[PDB]
Design a protein around this ligand. Sequence first.
Ligand SMILES: Cn1nnc2cc([C@H](CC(=O)O)c3ccc(Cl)cc3)ccc21
Ligand SMILES: Cn1nnc2cc([C@H](CC(=O)O)c3ccc(Cl)cc3)ccc21
Length: 289
Amino acid sequence: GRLIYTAGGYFRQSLSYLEAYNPSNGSWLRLADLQVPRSGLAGCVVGGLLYAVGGRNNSPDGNTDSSALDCYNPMTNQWSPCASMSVPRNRIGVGVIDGHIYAVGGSHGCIHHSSVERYEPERDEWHLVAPMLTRRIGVGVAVLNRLLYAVGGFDGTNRLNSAECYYPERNEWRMITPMNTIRSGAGVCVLHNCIYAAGGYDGQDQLNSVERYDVETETWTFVAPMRHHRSALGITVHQGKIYVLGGYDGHTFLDSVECYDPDSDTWSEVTRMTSGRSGVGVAVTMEPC
Ligand SMILES: Cn1nnc2cc([C@H](CC(=O)O)c3ccc(Cl)cc3)ccc21
Ligand SMILES: Cn1nnc2cc([C@H](CC(=O)O)c3ccc(Cl)cc3)ccc21
C-alpha cells in the first residue's frame, strides 16, 4: 500500500467522505463517498481492498447504528456492499487475521456489546466467535503474531484500563496486563513487537499520553505524548511509523495528523485533514488506478 485512506467520521453530523493521503508527497485526494454517512466505524484492508465496518449515521433526520460492511476497490473507485454483521456496532474496533476481519464490541442503542464476529471475504459471510470477557465500546483493537487484542473502551458504566487477548485456535479470550491509563476511544495499533494505545477519553479528559504493551514482557510502558490531546482518533501504520488522524480534544474536532517515529521517540505534525472530524475509519492500501 502507498496511501492512508480515511473514511467517514463526524463533524456536526456523520460524514460520507473518503479521502487518501500520500505521505510521499503531502497530497490529499477526495475519492468516492460512502453510500451511507457514518461515524464511529473502523477501516481495515484485506487483499488490497478497503473495508468500512460498523459505525452510526448521526444525522438530523435520525440516528441509525450500522451493521454494514462495505468494500472500496481502489482499482475502480467504487464502493460495494458486503454481507452485514449480526448486529449494529457503533464505536467498533476491528482486526484482521489471516485474511479474516474480526469485528469487536461497539454499541447498538444502549446495548454495549461483548460479542465478536468474523468475516470471511471468500464466502462473504459473518460468523460469531467467543465473546470478550468485557463489554467494550470505543474499543481499541490490534493484531500481533496472529493474536487479536481488545484494549480499553467503555462498558456502559466505566471507562476501562483493561485489555484482553483472543487465541483463535482455542476460540477463547483471556485478560492481559491492564494499561497504566483508563482509555476509551483511543487509537490502538501494532508496531514491531508492541501494541500501542494513543490518547482516548477517561470520562473526564481527552488524553495525549501514549503507552505500549510488549507481548514478551507483558508490561506497558509510556512513550512520548502526542502534541494534541485527542479521543475518537483514527490510527494506522504506514512505512513503520504510526499516524494518528483527527479526533476530539474537548474543544475542537481536530484536523491534526501526527506521526510517531519509534527510533527518535518523537511525534511530529505531518499534514492536516481537509476538515476537522472525529470517529473516522482509517487503513492503508494502494493508490487508486
Ligand atoms: C455538534 N457538536 N458540537 N460539539 C459537540 C460535542 C459533542 C460531545 C461533547 C459535548 O457534548 O460537549 C462529544 C464530542 C466528541 C465525542 Cl468523540 C463525543 C462526544 C457532541 C456533539 C457536538
Ligand atoms: C466528551 N467525549 N470526549 N471523548 C469522548 C469519547 C466518547 C466515546 C467513548 C466513551 O463514551 O467512553 C467514543 C469512543 C469512540 C468514538 Cl470513535 C467516539 C466516541 C464519548 C464522549 C467523549
